[PDB]
Amino acid sequence: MQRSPLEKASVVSKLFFSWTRPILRKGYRQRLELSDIYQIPSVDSADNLSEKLEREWDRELASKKNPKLINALRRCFFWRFMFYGIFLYLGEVTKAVQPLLLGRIIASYDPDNKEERSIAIYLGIGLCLLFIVRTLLLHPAIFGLHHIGMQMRIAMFSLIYKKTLKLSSRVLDKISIGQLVSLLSNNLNKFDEGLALAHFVWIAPLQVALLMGLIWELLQASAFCGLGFLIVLALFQAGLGRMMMKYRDQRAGKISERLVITSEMIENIQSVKAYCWEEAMEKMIENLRQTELKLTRKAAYVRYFNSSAFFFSGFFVVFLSVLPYALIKGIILRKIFTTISFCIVLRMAVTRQFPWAVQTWYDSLGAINKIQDFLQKQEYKTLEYNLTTTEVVMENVTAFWEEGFGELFGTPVLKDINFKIERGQLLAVAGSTGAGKTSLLMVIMGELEPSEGKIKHSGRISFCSQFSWIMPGTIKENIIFGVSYDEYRYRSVIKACQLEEDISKFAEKDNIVLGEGGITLSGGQRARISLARAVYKDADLYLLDSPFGYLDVLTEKEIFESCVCKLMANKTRILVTSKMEHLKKADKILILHEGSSYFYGTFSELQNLQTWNTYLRYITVHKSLIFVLIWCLVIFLAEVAASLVVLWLLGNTPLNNSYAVIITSTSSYYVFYIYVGVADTLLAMGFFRGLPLVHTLITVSKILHHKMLHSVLQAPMSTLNTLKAGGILNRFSKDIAILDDLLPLTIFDFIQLLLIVIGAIAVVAVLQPYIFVATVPVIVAFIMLRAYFLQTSQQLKQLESEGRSPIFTHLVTSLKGLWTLRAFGRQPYFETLFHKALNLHTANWFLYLSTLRWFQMRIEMIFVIFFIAVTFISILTTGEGEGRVGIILTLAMNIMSTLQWAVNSSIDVDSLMRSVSRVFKFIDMPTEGDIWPSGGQMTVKDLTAKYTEGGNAILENISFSISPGQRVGLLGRTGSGKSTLLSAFLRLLNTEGEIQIDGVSWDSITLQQWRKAFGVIPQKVFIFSGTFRKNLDPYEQWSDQEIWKVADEVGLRSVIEQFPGKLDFVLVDGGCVLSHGHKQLMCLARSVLSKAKILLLDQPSAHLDPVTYQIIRRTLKQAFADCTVILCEHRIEAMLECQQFLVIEENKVRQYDSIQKLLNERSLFRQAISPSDRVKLFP
Ligand SMILES: Nc1ncnc2c1ncn2[C@@H]1O[C@H](COP(=O)(O)OP(=O)(O)OP(=O)(O)O)[C@@H](O)[C@H]1O
Ligand SMILES: Nc1ncnc2c1ncn2[C@@H]1O[C@H](COP(=O)(O)OP(=O)(O)OP(=O)(O)O)[C@@H](O)[C@H]1O
Ligand SMILES: CC(C)(C)c1cc(C(C)(C)C)c(NC(=O)c2c[nH]c3ccccc3c2=O)cc1O
Ligand SMILES: [Mg+2]
Ligand SMILES: [Mg+2]
């Protein structure tokens, strides 16, 4: 890493921004090298800005009765804020005094021998000094203010991430990810750039006050009659401002709901593709955009009138000001041109600078109120007593989940429970699905607080969750989990948990970079890593929430006898399990039932008891847009044509006539200057040109999102395992919101300003030729410097834009794995790990931000340099009477003012046009591409399975044949390939060979038509946010009576009746309200509804007990009558049902007819079988 060149730099270098110069020269010739990206300055790091504001916020919490976050921000930013404000004031004041100096220099070309001709040179000197001071006075203050705004945002972002880790288990149900992601995605670039515009609240009034006097000098009565029109217009904009904000709050609720649906479906797309929910998910996301875009359009139409106010005002402010003075006294052109020059600044001050400044203050404080509201919430309390006899004691405990019934005190999940545990013995927590076994562990950890009862143990605890969580990184980084490495400990664990088999198969042996969640691995592999993490941790208590769910019996025995009873000796360790073998070796047993202790004692006792392309493609999405743009241009040509013949008549005039005083001399060089002043209004886009342009540009973003969401869903699996969670969630949140909100109007201003320049030059050029020639040398200078700047700016903007993903990627996983982070207590790791992601983004954003102010300053300096040259050539060459050089040049330089604004607008479009470029990359992804399934017989021949293209072959030369209406068992060691074989049928991963069904092959039919033959039950369960009926059939093909007629057989009768809205209860946080057992029965019903003749079952009974399993076989015997079944199961009770068996090992298959033969070969796998299951197989 290279250190910041800002650190060591002279006042000149910092003032003129010469320290940014290297990266432009480096970026112009070549592609940007990672080496060239400088380290962030020491001032604005994540640690310091956290440390500073954290201290000031707890001080605010400690002192005041009702604390406010703005008070905390005030005491560490206000002086440096106000320090730049006084410079930004003086830099703005100097724009208001330019008309006085320039106006005289213009008047000094007049043949009539005025005093001006005396002072002209002194004004010539002074006006040059007037420009030089402003250029140096404005830009540093803006960068200074941007730099403060960046520090403010980083400081809060860090306090949100510290706060969110200490947040209560009660609150997590209410606040989804969409709440957090939107809050950060909104403020990310908007807040930083804002603090430039913030000050103009108090700059604009003093500017109006200053300007009004200078006008009052010229026009005594009418100036106030003018101002009145702007006071009327200012209130109209304040009206639109309040109206626009109300549309934004109605929409904000809908965006949060779309992101949680969009996240969930892409997070586990492998299930979405298996069930064939493309039409379902697209229609669901489509319906949420209807409400959103309605409120976007209404917000967009209002903002047009706010934006357009400046351009229309121009003519009317001057007209109402000159007209009264004209009638009573009579006016000179000089007097008209001087008022025009004051009015341009006065409008800019009151019409664009004033309403933008206020709108920023609403957004900032609005944002700070949400953060302050988020910071003062219910926190997870800690009450650990390290003093103990290492005796984990529980007595007379009851607990309710929701606040209502618990506070009022529905049945509690635990009641009248008690147990004592000595150190050096394991507890067997047994019961049926929904007994409260997880709920019991949640009370011990203290995530679920008890209403009545008392807990006490030592603070040190270890936890193994039922849903296995893999943070992004290496298997080592997962197993050690943010502590020092130990060769003797690490190796003894992996051998005890026996991952040595699975780790050795991978190319990079130990350390492979696992994605968000670890979908690279299988169900059994994740569980053993989750276990290894819990084992490697040292603590007084080890909680294990059924880690033998996805493991085969041979592995389940070996790991239980090699880890739990060997490596974990002389420790209290409460275990969730439902097998006789585990309860036999166990010391004390606890059998829960309907949240009540059915039995408590010992096992002995229990038995005794009972670039051009990107711009072009965007325009040619929607055909309306190209018609509207042509329709604007033909009307533009008409108004350019209209002004031409007006000025042709006006200039050709042959002129008691007190209305307007003109003479041959004055006429020539004021009539044209007046036109350039009022050109902004004459060429302005009226509601007819404005509204449809805005309307279509929103309709484009609607079409672009549909294609993008459509293309992502039907892309191949390999491409979707490449990209991250935060990478998907970045675009759909931030880069779709840019095409809806910012881009539609940033274009309008760019077009509006571009037309005004062209049309003004055109009319002036056609009428007087030399001005066109005079502009060219200034025109080329801006286009030259623009083409030079963008070569660096474009490349920086992509690094910064793709530099966001790390912040989101981390925020997703952190939240999902929150319960283990607090179990182990690893917040200090994750905070410092999160600080990096902000620093990375700061390093790219700060660099892009600083490079801009260079271009902003240089473009102004180019103008100043040319103006200084123009003015001296004007004044010095001035003849004795009618000097016809300075006239022509200054008129050009009066246009280049409008162009300088258009070039700055042209950069603001290009930066937002990076968003649409990154959207098209997601649209341009590759694509995976009599009654038919009669009997359902399959024929596999020379099949090969691999995930990556040209990688390791998981299965090789596979070939077997199933007969019609036959049940087939599938089995093998954890990580054999059992899932890969089931995925090979649906052909999700890329394969070679052919699987032919009922004498018809793959290549004879389409994929989406092929996949509607199979009814799947995947290994990982997918429950999106919605109602039960929606989760049971998204297409809504079946009736309520039909769903109820299925619900009884799978036995969700009692499960649903618990909740208030029967089949209308909206599930949240990926269906966290249901227990692990009910999620398996949810997938079962979903398959029972979808009446298929072939169906695949990737381990139906994962964590189901022998009682609940009776439902699986009951529904498998009755409902699935004549259809062919491929049953991939670990429990041995399931093997009684199916006839043929497939065994996978050594990347190959073995088919068998009888169970007795299969078990006869493998002695170890036969000895593994439970005594209670052994009597069933062998009579
Ligand atoms: N966050 C929650 N909010 C509301 N109810 C919940 C929540 N978590 C669990 N429950 C409910 O509490 C009961 C017990 O759930 P718990 O997960 O403790 O059961 P379990 O015995 O661990 O089940 P399994 O055998 O499936 O693992 C169930 O009825 C479940 O729906
Ligand atoms: N998405 C993937 N990308 C790369 N390799 C993968 C992927 N999924 C699985 N594998 C590899 O294939 C092996 C077999 O995984 P698979 O899920 O088919 O096994 P399984 O027998 O179904 O496991 P389980 O006992 O957990 O059900 C894994 O151990 C891993 O090495
Ligand atoms: C009839 C005709 C000539 C097509 C026409 C009419 C108007 C109205 C009626 C809106 C003044 C306008 N005016 C506008 O479109 C205006 C657009 N934005 C504004 C913002 C603030 C204040 C006024 C306007 C405005 O008049 C323009 C026209 O070209
Ligand atoms: Mg459970
Ligand atoms: Mg599997």
Which ligand minimizes its atom distance to the CA of 305? 3
CA of 721, closest atom in ligand 2? 1
Which ligand minimizes its atom distance to the CA of 517? 2
* Residue in 413, 463, 1083 to alter for ligand 1 test, most ligand atoms within 8 A of Cβ: 413
Rounded distance between C-alpha atoms, residue 582 and residue 561, angstroms = 10
Residue 770 buriedness (CB in 10 A; 0-12 / 13-18 / 19+)? middle
Mention every residue, 6+ apart, whose C-beta is less than 8 A from residue 1049: 1088, 1111, 1114, 1115, 1118, 1119
Which ligand minimizes its atom distance to the CA of 689? 3
Whether 183 and 799 have beta carbons less than 8 Å apart is answered as no
Q: How far is the CA of 975 from the centre of ligand 2 (A)?
A: 5
CA of residue 294 relative to chain centroid, distance: 22
Give the H/E segment covering residue 1126.
Answer: strand 1124-1128
Which ligand minimizes its atom distance to the CA of 1077? 1
Rounded distance between C-alpha atoms, residue 682 and residue 430, angstroms = 83
775 is in an annotated binding site: no
Tokens of 289: 């955009």
Rounded distance between C-alpha atoms, residue 592 and residue 416, angstroms = 11
Rounded distance between C-alpha atoms, residue 325 and residue 329, angstroms = 6
Rounded distance between C-alpha atoms, residue 990 and residue 713, angstroms = 17
Mention every residue, 6+ apart, whose C-beta is less than 8 A from residue 770: 888
Decide: 158 in ligand 3 pocket, CB within 6 A.
Answer: no
- List b or e across 106-132, with b for residues whose CB sees 16 or more CB atoms inside 10 angstroms: bbbbbeeeeebbeebeebbeebbebbe
CA angle 689, 690, 696 (to 5 degrees): 95
CA of 313, closest atom in ligand 3? 22
Closest C-alpha among 1057, 1056, 1058 to residue 1031: 1056
434 is in an annotated binding site: yes
- Which regions of 755-870 does DSSP assign to beta strands (E)? none
Rounded distance between C-alpha atoms, residue 440 and residue 1011, angstroms = 42
Rounded distance between C-alpha atoms, residue 707 and residue 921, angstroms = 11
Tokens of 562: 């090699």
401 is in an annotated binding site: yes
Unique residue bearing structure tokens 């350390």 = 511
Q: How far is the CA of 474 from the centre of ligand 3 (A)?
A: 63
Closest C-alpha among 516, 200, 195 to residue 355: 200
DSSP per-residue string spanning 88-129: HHHHHHHHHSHHHHHHHHHHTT-SS--SHHHHHHHHHHHHHH
* Residue in 312, 631, 689 to alter for ligand 3 test, most ligand atoms within 8 A of Cβ: 312
Decide: 512 in ligand 2 pocket, CB within 6 A.
Answer: no
Closest C-alpha among 169, 168, 206, 171 to residue 88: 206
Q: How far is the CA of 531 from the centre of ligand 2 (A)?
A: 18
Whether 879 and 887 have beta carbons less than 8 Å apart is answered as no
Decide: 687 in ligand 3 pocket, CB within 6 A.
Answer: yes
CA angle 1136, 1138, 1144 (to 5 degrees): 105
Phi, psi of 882 (to 5 degrees): 65, 75
Q: How far is the CA of 523 from the centre of ligand 5 (A)?
A: 6
Rounded distance between C-alpha atoms, residue 235 and residue 572, angstroms = 72
Rounded distance between C-alpha atoms, residue 385 and residue 822, angstroms = 16
Decide: 435 in ligand 1 pocket, CB within 6 A.
Answer: yes
Rounded distance between C-alpha atoms, residue 107 and residue 117, angstroms = 9
In the 8-state DSSP scheme, what is residue 1135?
G
1062 is in an annotated binding site: no
Name the CA radius of gyration of the chain, rounded: 37
Tokens of 464: 């193994």
Whether 1027 and 1063 have beta carbons less than 8 Å apart is answered as yes
Whether 1023 and 1067 have beta carbons less than 8 Å apart is answered as yes
Give the H/E segment covering residue 737.
Answer: helix 736-740
Decide: 748 in ligand 3 pocket, CB within 6 A.
Answer: no
* Residues in the chain, overall count: 1179
Rounded distance between C-alpha atoms, residue 224 and residue 577, angstroms = 86
Whether 135 and 871 have beta carbons less than 8 Å apart is answered as no
- Which regions of 447-568 does DSSP assign to beta strands (E)? 452-456, 462-464, 542-545
In Å, how far are 428, 884, 887 from 108, measured between CA atoms?
101, 12, 10
Tokens of 158: 């860090």
Edge-first strand listing for the sheet containing 452-456: 414-421, 392-399, 452-456
Residue nearest to atom 29 of ligand 1 (CA): 434
Angle, in degrees to the nearest 10, between helices 333-347 and 279-328: 150
Which ligand minimizes its atom distance to the CA of 316? 3
Unique residue bearing structure tokens 């030592």 = 458
Rounded distance between C-alpha atoms, residue 1086 and residue 332, angstroms = 85
Rounded distance between C-alpha atoms, residue 360 and residue 504, angstroms = 58
In Å, how far are 770, 1119, 1153 from 1122, measured between CA atoms?
92, 9, 19
Decide: 1147 in ligand 1 pocket, CB within 6 A.
Answer: no
Mention every residue, 6+ apart, whose C-beta is less than 8 A from residue 1157: none
Tokens of 898: 């409008």
Decide: 525 in ligand 2 pocket, CB within 6 A.
Answer: yes
Rounded distance between C-alpha atoms, residue 1001 and residue 1010, angstroms = 10
- Other C-beta atoms lying within 10 Å of the C-beta of residue 298: 16
Q: How far is the CA of 1059 from the centre of ligand 1 (A)?
A: 13
Ramachandran class of 277: left when φ > 0, alpha when ψ lies in -120 to 50, beta otherwise: beta
Tokens of 786: 């623009």
CA of 506, closest atom in ligand 2? 31
126 is in an annotated binding site: no
Do the bridges between strand 1140-1145 and strand 1124-1128 make them parallel or antiparallel, or are there none, so unpaired?
unpaired
298 is in an annotated binding site: no
- Resolution of the determined structure in angstroms stands at 3.3
Closest C-alpha among 219, 427, 429 to residue 321: 219
Mention every residue, 6+ apart, whose C-beta is less than 8 A from residue 560: 548, 581, 582
In Å, how far are 223, 321, 330, 331, 656 from 327, measured between CA atoms?
15, 11, 6, 9, 13
Mention every residue, 6+ apart, whose C-beta is less than 8 A from residue 986: 273, 274, 1011, 1014, 1016, 1096
Closest C-alpha among 615, 931, 839 to residue 743: 615
Q: How far is the CA of 20 from the centre of ligand 4 (A)?
A: 58
Residue 672 buriedness (CB in 10 A; 0-12 / 13-18 / 19+)? buried
Rounded distance between C-alpha atoms, residue 681 and residue 661, angstroms = 24
Tokens of 415: 């009641």
Decide: 686 in ligand 3 pocket, CB within 6 A.
Answer: yes
Experimental approach was cryo-EM
Mention every residue, 6+ apart, whose C-beta is less than 8 A from residue 1028: 1043, 1056, 1063, 1064, 1065, 1067
Whether 964 and 1024 have beta carbons less than 8 Å apart is answered as no
Closest C-alpha among 985, 958, 976 to residue 1124: 985
Whether 367 and 359 have beta carbons less than 8 Å apart is answered as no
466 is in an annotated binding site: yes
Rounded distance between C-alpha atoms, residue 908 and residue 742, angstroms = 10
Whether 233 and 313 have beta carbons less than 8 Å apart is answered as yes
Rounded distance between C-alpha atoms, residue 645 and residue 806, angstroms = 60
Unique residue bearing structure tokens 């026009």 = 219
CA angle 338, 343, 349 (to 5 degrees): 140
945: which strand partners?
Answer: 955, 991
975 is in an annotated binding site: yes
435 is in an annotated binding site: yes
Decide: 270 in ligand 2 pocket, CB within 6 A.
Answer: no
666 is in an annotated binding site: no
Which ligand minimizes its atom distance to the CA of 976? 2
Do the bridges between strand 967-971 and strand 1124-1128 make them parallel or antiparallel, or are there none, so unpaired?
parallel
Tokens of 50: 């956290």
| Helix, strand, coil percentages for the chain (3-state, nearest 5) | 65, 10, 25
CA of 974, closest atom in ligand 2? 25
Decide: 1074 in ligand 1 pocket, CB within 6 A.
Answer: yes
**Type of residue found at 525:** Q
**Type of residue found at 591:** I
1061 is in an annotated binding site: no
In Å, how far are 84, 591, 593 from 598, measured between CA atoms?
72, 6, 6
Ramachandran class of 913: left when φ > 0, alpha when ψ lies in -120 to 50, beta otherwise: alpha
Rounded distance between C-alpha atoms, residue 937 and residue 519, angstroms = 31
Decide: 1076 in ligand 1 pocket, CB within 6 A.
Answer: yes
Decide: 595 in ligand 1 pocket, CB within 6 A.
Answer: no
Tokens of 625: 């847009």
Rounded distance between C-alpha atoms, residue 1170 and residue 694, angstroms = 71
Cα distance between the two ends of the chain: 72
3-state SS, one letter per residue, for 538-574: CCCEEEEECCCCCCCHHHHHHHHHHHHCCCCCCCEEE
Rounded distance between C-alpha atoms, residue 411 and residue 401, angstroms = 10
Decide: 304 in ligand 3 pocket, CB within 6 A.
Answer: no
Decide: 1149 in ligand 2 pocket, CB within 6 A.
Answer: no
Decide: 977 in ligand 2 pocket, CB within 6 A.
Answer: yes
Give the H/E segment covering residue 753.
Answer: helix 743-767
**Type of residue found at 778:** V
- Other C-beta atoms lying within 10 Å of the C-beta of residue 500: 10
701 is in an annotated binding site: no
Whether 983 and 957 have beta carbons less than 8 Å apart is answered as no
Tokens of 752: 């509006």
Decide: 980 in ligand 2 pocket, CB within 6 A.
Answer: yes
Residue nearest to atom 17 of ligand 2 (CA): 522
Decide: 979 in ligand 2 pocket, CB within 6 A.
Answer: yes
Decide: 308 in ligand 3 pocket, CB within 6 A.
Answer: yes
In the 8-state DSSP scheme, what is residue 168?
-
In the 8-state DSSP scheme, what is residue 65?
S
Residue 257 buriedness (CB in 10 A; 0-12 / 13-18 / 19+)? middle
- Other C-beta atoms lying within 10 Å of the C-beta of residue 953: 11
Angle, in degrees to the nearest 10, between helices 116-165 and 353-375: 20
974 is in an annotated binding site: yes
Q: How far is the CA of 1135 from the centre of ligand 2 (A)?
A: 22
Mention every residue, 6+ apart, whose C-beta is less than 8 A from residue 436: 413, 414, 592, 595
* Residue in 683, 687, 689, 691 to alter for ligand 3 test, most ligand atoms within 8 A of Cβ: 687
Decide: 312 in ligand 3 pocket, CB within 6 A.
Answer: yes
Unique residue bearing structure tokens 């919605």 = 1026
In the 8-state DSSP scheme, what is residue 1011?
G
- List b or e across 880-918, with b for residues whose CB sees 16 or more CB atoms inside 10 angstroms: eeebebbbbbbbbbbbbebbbebbbbbbebbbbbbbbbb
Rounded distance between C-alpha atoms, residue 753 and residue 764, angstroms = 17
432 is in an annotated binding site: yes
Rounded distance between C-alpha atoms, residue 428 and residue 583, angstroms = 6
